[PDB]
Amino acid sequence: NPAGQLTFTQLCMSGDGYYQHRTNLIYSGGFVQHYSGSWAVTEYGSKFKKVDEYATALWRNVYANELKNVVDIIKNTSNDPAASNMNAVAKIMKVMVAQRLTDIYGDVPYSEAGVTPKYDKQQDIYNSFFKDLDESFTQLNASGGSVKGDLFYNGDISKWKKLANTMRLRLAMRISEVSPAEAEKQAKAAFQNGVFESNDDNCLMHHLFRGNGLSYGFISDEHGDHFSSLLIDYLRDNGDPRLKMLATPKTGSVNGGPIGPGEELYEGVRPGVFRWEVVGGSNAASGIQPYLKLRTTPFLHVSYSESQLLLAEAAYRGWVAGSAADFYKKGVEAGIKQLEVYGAAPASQASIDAYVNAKPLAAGTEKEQIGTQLWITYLFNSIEAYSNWRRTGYPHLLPITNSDSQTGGVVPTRLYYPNDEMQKNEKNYMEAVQRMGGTNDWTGKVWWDVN
């Protein structure tokens, strides 16, 4: 069971098209303006319109499929010393499973989860995260038995250690605004225990729940999704090599008909604007490279690029030892190269070096630059970009002025608990609601988001 259960959970974290489509693509992806153009993403994610199913899909599927399995693994490997390594792996898994959850809904059932479980305060959920990652790092050992059913890493515990520490750093940075002391402490700890050391250590699912769920969303939108004008303009105007690794060129001209010499080939779709409303029609906007949208497209969970960019930010705060600029450079290069696993033509080392050296970490714009780079690195993992945007306010997004925006253009700052919780778990539901100021609304804030 432990192996099979681990494999099932790992496959649920990327192959469940149900919430990859709704939570990653449509809402997170539209909120942080990774995408625009398709009906679903633009109408609901880009312009801000509520659909209960879309907002509660992550909740429903994490509690139905994932949390329970990983709890059962932890329970069944708990006192067997030849299973300790599995016990640790499962615990690391459990953080990755639950972290998205709290980050999207705030206070959530955790400690009593997996008939009326309480909602843990997010602060406690996070202390519990740090505890499990710390202890799980230490617990992974040569004498811990073998790890079976691991698709991320085929049971290499050395990679599990660094995954544990990189997750720890991600959580540390996420509470930088609300709990700076704990944040620094945990960043430093993560750094010294050892995070990812190259792109080889990246947490990936290779798809051969068996297909990439995100691509499932891309395909159910009838390949109607484009990158947003914000992203394309940023990649194009700064000469980022990732531009053509990600985007397909325009085929039509803004003036209609086939595109002629001289006219810009790379433009995204403005947030709030459907692809058929583009001046020139949808051909007059860049598309998404086909290898990114396949059932066999790999899914990236945690990255070396991310760890280096987070270390850049911690460095700039004086939390860890080193040069922010050097961490930053290593992060950008790692992000440019991480796209290769998607089937993208590797960028020449000369172009990477040229880009990195032409636009280094600058004097008063470190946080802006770091946020923007992470926002690029978290592409196809929009939940993380949405969180990092909520925490830092970076990158600055294009204003949403659509007259039918249900928030008047205000970015939603959480998704909301399903009303089923009010009907089946009323007391605890209401306690969490009270702690939010009296509402279960998408304009509410999670604990670490202290404007």
Author numbering: 36 to 149, 157 to 250, 263 to 505
Q: What does the publication say?
A:
The studied chitin utilization locus (ChiUL) is encoded by the soil saprophyte Flavobacterium johnsoniae, which is a Bacteroidetes member exhibiting gliding motility. The ChiUL of F. johnsoniae consists of eleven genes that encode four enzymes, a predicted inner membrane transporter, a predicted two-component sensor/regulator system (TCS), and two individual SusC/D-like pairs (CusC/D, chitin utilization system). The SusC/D-like pairs are believed to be specific for their cognate carbohydrate targets, and act in concert to bind (SusD) and transport (SusC) oligosaccharides across the outer membrane. The resulting ChiOs, and likely chitin crystals as well (analogous to the archetypal starch-binding SusD protein of B. thetaiotaomicron), are captured by the CusD proteins.
